[PDB]
Amino acid sequence: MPIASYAQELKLALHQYPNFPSEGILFEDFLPIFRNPGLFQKLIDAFKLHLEEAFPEVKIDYIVGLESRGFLFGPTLALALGVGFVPVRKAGKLPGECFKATYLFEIQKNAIPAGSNVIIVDDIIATGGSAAAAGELVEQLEANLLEYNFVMELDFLKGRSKLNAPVFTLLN
Amino acid sequence: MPIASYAQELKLALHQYPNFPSEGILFEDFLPIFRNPGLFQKLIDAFKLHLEEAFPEVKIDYIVGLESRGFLFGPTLALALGVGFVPVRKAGKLPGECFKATYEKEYGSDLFEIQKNAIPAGSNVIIVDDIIATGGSAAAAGELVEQLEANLLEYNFVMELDFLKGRSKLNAPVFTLLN
Numbered sequence: 171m172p173i174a175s176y177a178q179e180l181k182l183a184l185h186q187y188p189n190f191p192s193e194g195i196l197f198e199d200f201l202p203i204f205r206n207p208g209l210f211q212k213l214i215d216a217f218k219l220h221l222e223e224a225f226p227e228v229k230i231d232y233i234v235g236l237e238s239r240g241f242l243f244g245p246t247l248a249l250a251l252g253v254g255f256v257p258v259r260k261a262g263k264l265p266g267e268c269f270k271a272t273y274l275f276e277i278q279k280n281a282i283p284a285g286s287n288v289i290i291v292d293d294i295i296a297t298g299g300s301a302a303a304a305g306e307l308v309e310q311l312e313a314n315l316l317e318y319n320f321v322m323e324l325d326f327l328k329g330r331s332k333l334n335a336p337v338f339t340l341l342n
Numbered sequence: 343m344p345i346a347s348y349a350q351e352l353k354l355a356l357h358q359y360p361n362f363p364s365e366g367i368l369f370e371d372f373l374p375i376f377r378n379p380g381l382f383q384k385l386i387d388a389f390k391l392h393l394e395e396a397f398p399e400v401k402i403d404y405i406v407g408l409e410s411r412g413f414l415f416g417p418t419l420a421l422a423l424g425v426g427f428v429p430v431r432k433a434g435k436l437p438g439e440c441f442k443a444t445y446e447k448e449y450g451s452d453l454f455e456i457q458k459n460a461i462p463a464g465s466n467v468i469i470v471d472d473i474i475a476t477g478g479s480a481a482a483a484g485e486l487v488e489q490l491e492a493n494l495l496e497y498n499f500v501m502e503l504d505f506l507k508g509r510s511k512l513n514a515p516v517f518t519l520l521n
């Protein structure tokens with residue numbers, strides 16, 4: 171499968187950092203994928219192929235990416251798909267009238283029309299709180315949340331239980 | 343020229359927000375470019391064309407993008423060029439051994455970082471960010487590229503606040519797409 175082979179090669183590119191940011195935490199650094207345009211293209215194509223597989227006759231209108239590491243691939247995935255990108259940002263970073271969701275995250279009220287089909291993207295799901303907030307913001311837009319797309323998922327934290335929409339994680 | 347037509351259309355897409363984040367500050371919101379894949383592609387192509395024009399027989403090895411709004415287009419520009427992307431992040435966000443460069447905001451001397459292993463010495467680099475204001479953040483990124491022993495070919499900005507004279511803090515040449 172094209173997705174599995176790319177998922178394996180991207181897994182190998184990850185760099186493990188014991189005890190960062192603090193004692194006990196194992197940091198999965200996906201940044202090495204972005205320094206190699208071959209690997210980066212594979213990550214984008216992997217997500218693209220999955221969305222083509224999951225949603226063959228459903229038009230995606232936007233990728234919604236979470237600040238800050240979702241910004242590293244979300245916009246690029248959006249452009250690969252030929253769709254818009256919209257950020258979900260931390261509190262007080264977006265100008266103009268915003269909707270708010272507590273975790274505080276925000277989205278711009280004018281960014282996405284009602285009835286738009288949306289995919290939320292982020293590097294990793296841990297507790298799920300940030301992703302859940304993004305979902306609340308998509309809901310306040312009256313937009314449709316087709317799926318959450320993550321690069322990594324910390325299964326032991328049970329982040330997906332806080333979420334309503336279906337979840338895809340590329341590297342399990 | 344293609345650059346200019348795209349620059350005009352991207353200028354029109356910007357949304358002005360008076361008195362954000364505080365009184366007196368005029369916020370230039372470039373986020374409307376990213377909601378429209380046509381506009382987004384034009385921004386990427388504009389930068390691509392400019393780098394092809396400025397550096398026709400010089401291989402760019404990396405785009406270095408500043409956190410957080412440089413992340414919105416830097417990686418995508420990197421992939422369009424067929425080159426690596428490396429982030430410059432705020433203090434304590436990058437794992438592993440990092441180089442450090444100081445910058446000041448208003449009531450604070452905060453800190454940027456880059457990963458020591460990210461870029462080899464002698465790599466040719468373009469630093470990218472949404473906007474240059476005081477120039478402090480861009481200057482810090484330059485100090486990090488220098489600690490890498492990498493070559494800073496150019497700074498590339500979407501917008502520039504000319505009245506702040508941010509350019510004067512920088513050593514390498516500067517390109518701003520929307521003047």
Ligand SMILES: O=P(O)(O)OC[C@@H]1N[C@@H](COP(=O)(O)O)[C@@H](O)[C@H]1O
Pocket residue numbers: 236237238239240292293294295296297298299300301329435
């Ligand atoms: O799943 P939760 O809400 O616990 O965390 C989500 C992650 N938090 C970010 C990293 O944490 P931060 O650097 O913002 O403190 C990741 O990029 C993901 O968005």
Ligand SMILES: O=P(O)(O)OC[C@@H]1N[C@@H](COP(=O)(O)O)[C@@H](O)[C@H]1O
Pocket residue numbers: 263408409410411412471472473474475476477478479480508
């Ligand atoms: O030119 P300076 O150093 O004054 O500012 C650079 C800008 N500051 C960021 C926004 O500032 P922040 O939202 O972190 O307060 C922009 O994306 C640019 O990087």
Ligand SMILES: Nc1ncnc2[nH]cnc12
Pocket residue numbers: 367368369370371473475503
């Ligand atoms: N006027 C401004 N608009 C957008 N971003 C900024 N960063 C610093 N000053 C800014």
